[PDB]
Amino acid sequence: GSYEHVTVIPNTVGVPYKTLVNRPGYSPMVLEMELLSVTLEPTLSLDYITCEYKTVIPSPYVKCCGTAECKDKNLPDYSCKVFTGVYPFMWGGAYCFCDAENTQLSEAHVEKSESCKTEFASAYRAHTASASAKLRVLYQGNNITVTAYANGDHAVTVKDAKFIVGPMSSAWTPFDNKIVVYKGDVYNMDYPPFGAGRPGQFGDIQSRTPESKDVYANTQLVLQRPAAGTVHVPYSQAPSGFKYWLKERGASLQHTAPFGCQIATNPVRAVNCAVGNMPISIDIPEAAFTRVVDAPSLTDMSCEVPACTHSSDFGGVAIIKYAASKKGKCAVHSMTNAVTIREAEIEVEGNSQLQISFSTALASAEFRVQVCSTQVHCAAECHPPKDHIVNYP
Amino acid sequence: PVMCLLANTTFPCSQPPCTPCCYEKEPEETLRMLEDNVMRPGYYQLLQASLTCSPDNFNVYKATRPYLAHCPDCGEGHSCHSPVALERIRNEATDGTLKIQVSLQIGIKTDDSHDWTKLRYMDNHMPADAERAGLFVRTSAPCTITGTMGHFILARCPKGETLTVGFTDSRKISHSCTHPFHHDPPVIGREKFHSRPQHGKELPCSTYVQSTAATTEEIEVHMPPDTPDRTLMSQQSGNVKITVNGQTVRYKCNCGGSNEGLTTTDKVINNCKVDQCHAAVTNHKKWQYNSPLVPRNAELGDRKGKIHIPFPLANVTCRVPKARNPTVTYGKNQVIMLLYPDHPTLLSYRNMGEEPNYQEEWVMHKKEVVLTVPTEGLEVTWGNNEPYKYWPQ
Amino acid sequence: GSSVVSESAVSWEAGARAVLRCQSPRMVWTQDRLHDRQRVLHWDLRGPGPARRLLDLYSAGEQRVYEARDRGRLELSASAFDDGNFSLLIRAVEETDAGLYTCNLHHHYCHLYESLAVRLEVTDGPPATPAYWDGEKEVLAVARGAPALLTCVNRGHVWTDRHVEEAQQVVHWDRQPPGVPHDRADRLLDLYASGERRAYGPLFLRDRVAVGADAFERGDFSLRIEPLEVADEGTYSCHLHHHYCGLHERRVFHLTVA
Ligand SMILES: *[C@@H]1O[C@H](CO)[C@@H](O[C@H]2O[C@H](CO)[C@@H](O)[C@H](O)[C@H]2NC(C)=O)[C@H](O)[C@H]1NC(C)=O
Ligand SMILES: *[C@@H]1O[C@H](CO)[C@@H](O)[C@H](O)[C@H]1NC(C)=O
């Protein structure tokens, strides 16, 4: 029968945010939280895949002293044509005995290549993504880890401490309603639907599954005329739109998606998208709470800062002399927004001094710090750092 | 219990009635049996069982043979009937391994035995051995061959616009066939390198495995056409005389009497001259690639059989270089990077705001570039190195 | 050249299709066999048919013995075509070598044929009046194991020439108005090996005068005239010429219209 604390932190991975647990009649607590990963897993649906195509040309039917006739069969892009006035030459001489009435029947068609099992591109329908996240919590001085759905519907019971996360403040996904995936990369593309592929373009040949025996394809296959005295089947045909797309694709979402999203395939997922914010519900059990009577209450505390430097990191060092009531753990919180403290919990025993760190951006820092029961003031001057550019949030 | 059909009967495909040594017993009958069952699912069972002969000894190349086909550039410009003619070139491998298919058979002697130091071509009626060591493939520089078996050659060709395949036959006279082929393998990753470096990064790719295990891919084969040869006819001073030379000959004469026929022995047509007659050599005992460069046997219908082929496609790992660390200098909302590329290296940077304004450029030489560092964030991808992150203080 | 073989006389109507059949298969030229199937040589054997092929030779290098057991025992000059010595040497004559040998040649370039027959007898003892009968097939008697030299020699330029690569021909079509002494006849068409359709006539004459398209690989150089003018009557000449192979042929045609 504990208490339910609620807070809101920006959905930014690697930024430690401090909250102040305030239970009536109990010593305050300084919870540090650091989001580790945020998974955006969209529900997908397969439309079709595309691959390099294979032009099948069986041996021509050279009918000597006669005329052949075509028969339009049901093969993808079946291309038949009869040719007159031929005198085919094999090295041993003339195949056809007659001087006239020689015909060559040329057939061809298109099917999936033998390489369509490894080199392929999957065209999917992405909609209504699903979320998941992972967070580090500094509670009881312990770095604990939580993993749940980032929607606020399912809770994690970790050491009798219930944790609820969600829903996402943003319903964003760098994946459009229609996407394409090639084996290591995700692309946004309004791909031509099944039955609308154009020659030279993406998916000049299409198949719902890599195994489905029947496929759809039009590659503008037209048979030319064979050169005189020669047995061959020349064609004109739009080349593979796949290999064209392989050169012509451009960078994937791993390099171009906004908000610094990370893109990973199998499953198609987006990680660490710094968008919106996220709520956190912590139902702390009542057992670990401790009243003020049992809590060390510090009195007659002083603050001193020998050196400080305003920057993104904890560029200031502080030391607090105190007179604690007894030996035990206690918390260290910063009441003000513009000032943050690296420390959250230190050990107090009688009279001693403690060493902590703090961070802000201004030169002259004036703020108050409370140690586990009582406040005190700290003031100093902070220099600028040597770095204008920093490689951490 | 998978059944195959003869013409009126059914039987298990793995146990035909001609067992054992089906081919050696009756060649023509065994091939027709395979042809009639080409569409049935247990065909490849029938093939493994009706071609092996032990005293496994399954050697498919007893039924196939090399052949002559048309080649456009046999060297010195003109076109010739080449015994090393090409059929198709495959460049689906991401590493650039070419899978070349030619009209000779590597690794098989005329007696159908397996031997890697030999290959069999066709010499105007009769296959003949030749030294494998004399085979070569080159585009602009000689290609390093990685595998040879049957009709198929794996090679590593350098950047080139043509492709030549040739060997040296029995009589130490060279044969060669040259086709146009735009060979420039696609670049893996984000840098254009030429020989895998030391430290690098491991990226996915596709290559042609160097094993000769016949598992997945297949080609089509059928009986050869009636092959002509002008040497068969002779002039017995008023008439025509033909010689079979251990084969069967289909002759046709433009005179009286039995002006045509299929003779197994030497025959003579009277009241005729040579120019009125024309004869070819039938051979229903071997198979041949269903090639557009070779006509189809007219008398038989669309009889066809299929045989597996070596060197399938399989995805493996290629290793690419990581570009060296650039020189970094800082400034107010500015990062100055001096890049030292040893080869064409791709550079990309995206802001972590809602408008990333992704910019990329193929950095070629040493260049000092200056990038704005907005408060939202900046991600710099340099070659295949892990993404740099830069923020303002 | 001037080696007139046959003369014709045709009579077509005014404005009808006139075709002068000048067809010769000795001029067929499609593509180079690259000097490897240009000329071939082969010997045959008789028991007594059936005749059996012993070994053949191309214009490139060494020979091929179709029987493996006979290998190394039969030997032609590996440098024959350089000087034309197509003789066959049988080092060890066995009794199964008795029969009727024949030396057959082929010149697919110019479509020639020059054969010769030679009989061989195996005498169990010493020579048995070996060589005779010049007027017909020459027969050689050879003892068991002794060598035999069966002569087949042709020294013509057409055979022993590692020379020009497979192609040079020329076909002229000449015209003679009535009474012309042929000394200064009109030139109409030229057809060359690689192809030069040189039309020499006036512009509105070379619109009906057209040698059939593709007509250098069937050997049918028939001249076509779609409309027949009455003034087009005369003696046309299908001037043929193929040097290096003796084709100084010429066919003549007399075209009359009524
Ligand atoms: C809790 O987790 C944090 C994050 O991993 C730990 O990180 C700190 O430890 C290092 C010790 O030298 C410091 O150098 C790091 O800068 C610091 N890292 C961060 C991100 O703050 C921390 O030690 C852990 N503490 C406990 C009690 O578990
Ligand atoms: C690798 O190839 C197999 C087919 O051999 C395919 O099923 C698999 O999906 C491929 N994997 C990748 C990562 O491309």
The residue ranges of every structural domain in chain C are: 1-31+165-258, 32-164
Rounded Cα–Cα distance for residues C55 and C44 (Å): 8
Residues 6+ apart with CB under 8 A from A23: A3, A289
Please compute, for residue C238, the number of CA atoms within 13 A of its CA located in the half-sphere on the CB side.
24
Is the domain of A29 the same as that of A147?
yes
User: C35 — contact with chain A (CB < 8 Å)?
Assistant: no
Contact between A38 and A264 (Cβ < 8 Å):
no
Q: Among candidates A352, A354, A328, which has minimal Cα distance to A342?
A: A354
User: B366 — contact with chain A (CB < 8 Å)?
Assistant: no
| Ligand 1 atom having least distance to the Cα of A136 | 2
Ligand 1 mean position, distance from CA A38 (Å): 21
Contact residues, chain A, for C30 at CB < 8 Å:
89, 228-229
Q: Among candidates B306, B310, B311, B312, which has minimal Cα distance to B64?
A: B306
Ligand 2 mean position, distance from CA A50 (Å): 14
Residues 6+ apart with CB under 8 A from A335: A367, A368, A369, A370, A375
At A226, the amino acid letter reads P
Rounded Cα–Cα distance for residues C78 and A376 (Å): 113
User: Over the Cα atoms of chain B, what is R_g?
Assistant: 30
How far B165 CA lies from chain C's nearest CA (Å)? 17
User: How far apart, in Å, are the Cα atoms of A335 and each of A29, A332, A338, A371?
Assistant: 12, 10, 9, 11
| Tokens found for residue A77 | 């892009």
At A355, which helix (H) or strand (E)? strand A351-359
Is the domain of A336 the same as that of A247?
no
Q: What backbone phi and psi angles, to 5 degrees, belong to A281?
A: -115, 120
Residues 6+ apart with CB under 8 A from B379: A260, B349, B350, B351, B352, B387, B388, B389, B390
Kindly determine whether residue C220 and residue A229, on different chains, have CB atoms separated by under 8 Å: no
Neighbours of A292 (CB within 10 A): 12
For C136, the 3-state DSSP assignment is: coil
Rounded Cα–Cα distance for residues C182 and C171 (Å): 17
Contact residues, chain B, for A183 at CB < 8 Å:
204
Domain that includes residue A69, residue range: 44-127+176-256
Is the domain of A316 the same as that of A201?
no
Rounded Cα–Cα distance for residues A243 and A219 (Å): 14
Rounded Cα–Cα distance for residues B317 and B207 (Å): 9
- A385 upstream amide cis, omega within 30 of 0: no
For C61, the 3-state DSSP assignment is: coil
Rounded Cα–Cα distance for residues A86 and A66 (Å): 11
Which listed ligand is nearest to B217 at the C-alpha?
2
The segment(s) of chain B belonging to CATH 2.60.40.4310 are: 227-281
Q: What backbone phi and psi angles, to 5 degrees, belong to B286?
A: -125, 165
| Tokens found for residue B235 | 């002039």
For A256, the 3-state DSSP assignment is: helix
Closest residue (by CA) to atom 8 of ligand 1? A342
Kindly determine whether residue B330 and residue A387, on different chains, have CB atoms separated by under 8 Å: yes
Rounded Cα–Cα distance for residues A109 and A80 (Å): 9
- DSSP code, position B253: E
Contact between B380 and B390 (Cβ < 8 Å):
yes
Is the domain of A95 the same as that of A244?
yes
Contact between B210 and B311 (Cβ < 8 Å):
yes
| A5 backbone φψ class: left, alpha, beta (φ>0; ψ -120 to 50) | beta
Contact between A388 and B392 (Cβ < 8 Å):
yes
| Tokens found for residue C4 | 């007139």
Rounded Cα–Cα distance for residues B108 and B91 (Å): 26
Q: Among candidates B338, B325, B355, B305, which has minimal Cα distance to B47?
A: B305
Ligand 1 mean position, distance from CA A328 (Å): 22
Contact between B95 and B207 (Cβ < 8 Å):
yes
Please compute, for residue B110, the number of CA atoms within 13 A of its CA located in the half-sphere on the CB side.
13
Pick from C33, C49, C66: CB nearest B266 = C49
Rounded Cα–Cα distance for residues B356 and B381 (Å): 13
| Tokens found for residue A199 | 């020659």
- DSSP code, position A64: T
Q: What backbone phi and psi angles, to 5 degrees, belong to A173?
A: -155, 120
Q: Which residues of B38-65 are buried (b: 16+ CB within 10 A; e: fewer)?
A: beeebbebbbbbbbbbeeeeeebbbbbb
CATH number of B1-55: 1.10.287.2230
Q: What backbone phi and psi angles, to 5 degrees, belong to A149?
A: -75, 130
Contact between A243 and A202 (Cβ < 8 Å):
no
- DSSP states along C142-200: EETT--EEE------TTTS---S-S---EEEEEE--TT--STTPEEEEEEESS---EE-
Starting at the edge strand found earlier in the chain, the sheet holding A156-158 runs A3-10, A277-284, A161-165, A156-158
For C80, the 3-state DSSP assignment is: helix
Residues 271-330 (A) with a CB less than 8 A from some CB of B: 274, 311-312
- DSSP H helices in chain A: 241-248, 253-256
Residue with tokens 């023509």: B28
Fold adopted by B321-393: Immunoglobulin-like (2.60.40)
Rounded Cα–Cα distance for residues B380 and B389 (Å): 6
Q: Among candidates A305, A318, A309, which has minimal Cα distance to A385?
A: A309
Pick from C40, C49, C66: CB nearest B265 = C49
User: How far apart, in Å, are the Cα atoms of B47 and each of B32, B60, B174, C222?
Assistant: 12, 8, 36, 54
Residue with tokens 């005189």: A228
Q: Which residues of A107-117 are buried (b: 16+ CB within 10 A; e: fewer)?
A: bbbbbbbbbbb
Fold adopted by B56-226+282-320: Immunoglobulin-like (2.60.40)
Rounded Cα–Cα distance for residues B73 and B81 (Å): 10
Rounded Cα–Cα distance for residues C44 and C63 (Å): 14
User: How far apart, in Å, are the Cα atoms of A239 and each of A53, A201, B291, B331?
Assistant: 8, 9, 21, 50
Work out how many CB contacts closer than 8 A connect A with B.
Answer: 148
Rounded Cα–Cα distance for residues B384 and B371 (Å): 19
Q: What backbone phi and psi angles, to 5 degrees, belong to C176?
A: -135, 110
| Tokens found for residue B129 | 């051995």
The segment(s) of chain B belonging to CATH 2.60.40.3200 are: 56-226+282-320
Neighbours of C172 (CB within 10 A): 18
For A97, the 3-state DSSP assignment is: coil
Contact between B219 and B306 (Cβ < 8 Å):
yes
CB-based burial label for B192 (10 Å; 0-12, 13-18, 19+): middle
Q: Among candidates B185, B190, B187, which has minimal Cα distance to B322?
A: B190
Q: Which residues line ligand 1 (CB under 6 A)?
A: A 141, 143
For A247, the 3-state DSSP assignment is: helix
Q: Among candidates C87, B188, B311, which has minimal Cα distance to A184?
A: B188
Residue with tokens 């050697």: B59
Contact between A377 and A348 (Cβ < 8 Å):
no
Rounded Cα–Cα distance for residues B391 and B110 (Å): 72
Q: What backbone phi and psi angles, to 5 degrees, belong to B170?
A: -60, -50
The segment(s) of chain B belonging to CATH 1.10.287.2230 are: 1-55
Q: Please give the resolution of this entry in Å, rounded to 1 decimal.
A: 3.5
Rounded Cα–Cα distance for residues C149 and C170 (Å): 42
Q: Among candidates A53, A259, A281, A25, which has minimal Cα distance to A148?
A: A281
Q: Among candidates C151, C213, B389, which has minimal Cα distance to A260?
A: B389
CB-based contacts of A379-382 (< 8 A; 24+ apart in sequence): A379/A305, A380/A305, A380/A308, A380/A316, A381/A308, A382/A308, A382/A309, A382/A310, A382/A315, A382/A316
At B28, which helix (H) or strand (E)? helix B27-36
E strand intervals along chain C = 7-12, 18-20, 39-45, 52-58, 64-65, 74-76, 88-90, 99-107, 116-123, 138-143, 148-150, 170-175, 186-192, 198-199, 210-211, 223-225, 234-241, 250-257
Q: Among candidates A389, B190, B234, which has minimal Cα distance to C49?
A: B234
Ligand 2 mean position, distance from CA A43 (Å): 22
| B237 backbone φψ class: left, alpha, beta (φ>0; ψ -120 to 50) | left
Q: Among candidates A19, A14, A16, which has minimal Cα distance to A29?
A: A19
| Tokens found for residue A78 | 């079946």
At residue A243's C-alpha, the angle toward residues A237 and A245, to 5°, is 110
Pairing of strands C88-90, C148-150: antiparallel
- DSSP states along B69-124: EEESBSSSS--EEETT-EEEEE---TT--EEEEEEEEEEE-TTS-EEEEEEEEEET
Is the domain of A284 the same as that of A139?
yes
Q: Which chains touch A (3 or more CB pairs under 8 A)?
A: B, C
CB-based burial label for A51 (10 Å; 0-12, 13-18, 19+): buried
**Length of chain A, in residues:** 393
CB-based burial label for B203 (10 Å; 0-12, 13-18, 19+): middle
| Tokens found for residue A391 | 């490689």
Helix axes B43-50, B27-36, angle to 10 degrees: 170
| Tokens found for residue A309 | 């430097």
Which listed ligand is nearest to A346 at the C-alpha?
1
Q: Among candidates A10, A19, A12, which has minimal Cα distance to A341?
A: A19
Kindly determine whether residue C217 and residue A228, on different chains, have CB atoms separated by under 8 Å: yes
**Length of chain B, in residues:** 393
Residue with tokens 């529900």: A43
Fold adopted by B227-281: Immunoglobulin-like (2.60.40)
For B37, the 3-state DSSP assignment is: coil
Contact between A94 and B227 (Cβ < 8 Å):
no
Residues 6+ apart with CB under 8 A from B293: A231, A232, B69, B70, B85, B87, B103
- DSSP states along A143-165: EEEEEE-TTSSS-EEETTEEEEE
Q: Among candidates B100, B86, B147, B308, which has minimal Cα distance to B219?
A: B308
| A248 backbone φψ class: left, alpha, beta (φ>0; ψ -120 to 50) | alpha
Is the domain of A117 the same as that of A191?
yes
Rounded Cα–Cα distance for residues B37 and B32 (Å): 9
Count how many domains chain A has.
3
Is the domain of A274 the same as that of A206?
no
Q: What backbone phi and psi angles, to 5 degrees, belong to B62?
A: -70, -20
CB-based burial label for B333 (10 Å; 0-12, 13-18, 19+): middle
- DSSP code, position A26: B
Q: What backbone phi and psi angles, to 5 degrees, belong to A295?
A: -90, 140
Is the domain of A205 the same as that of A246?
yes
Q: What backbone phi and psi angles, to 5 degrees, belong to C10?
A: -120, 150
Helix-strand-coil split of chain B, %, nearest 5: 10, 45, 45
At B48, which helix (H) or strand (E)? helix B43-50
| Tokens found for residue A217 | 């394809």
Is the domain of A85 the same as that of A183?
yes
What is the dihedral sign for C-alpha B316, A56, A217, B179? positive
At residue B168's C-alpha, the angle toward residues B164 and B170, to 5°, is 150
At A294, the amino acid letter reads D
Contact between C76 and C86 (Cβ < 8 Å):
yes
Q: What experimental approach yielded this model?
A: X-ray
Residue with tokens 């009869």: A82
User: How far apart, in Å, are the Cα atoms of C225 and each of A22, A100, C15, C212?
Assistant: 113, 20, 9, 10
- Gap sites in chain B (C to N > 2.5 Å), preceding residue numbers: 55
Residues 6+ apart with CB under 8 A from C182: C176, C235, C237
User: How far apart, in Å, are the Cα atoms of A141 and each of A30, A157, A283, A331, B224?
Assistant: 10, 18, 17, 10, 84
Rounded Cα–Cα distance for residues A246 and C194 (Å): 43
Residue with tokens 């009455």: C230
Q: Among candidates B346, B377, B357, B360, which has minimal Cα distance to A260?
A: B377
Residue with tokens 């880890």: A145
CB-based burial label for A342 (10 Å; 0-12, 13-18, 19+): middle
User: How far apart, in Å, are the Cα atoms of C82 and each of A154, C59, C167?
Assistant: 96, 9, 20
| Tokens found for residue C164 | 């020009």
- DSSP H helices in chain C: 80-83
Q: Which residues line ligand 2 (CB under 6 A)?
A: A 117-118, 183; B 204, 314-315
For A253, the 3-state DSSP assignment is: helix
Is the domain of A115 the same as that of A156?
no
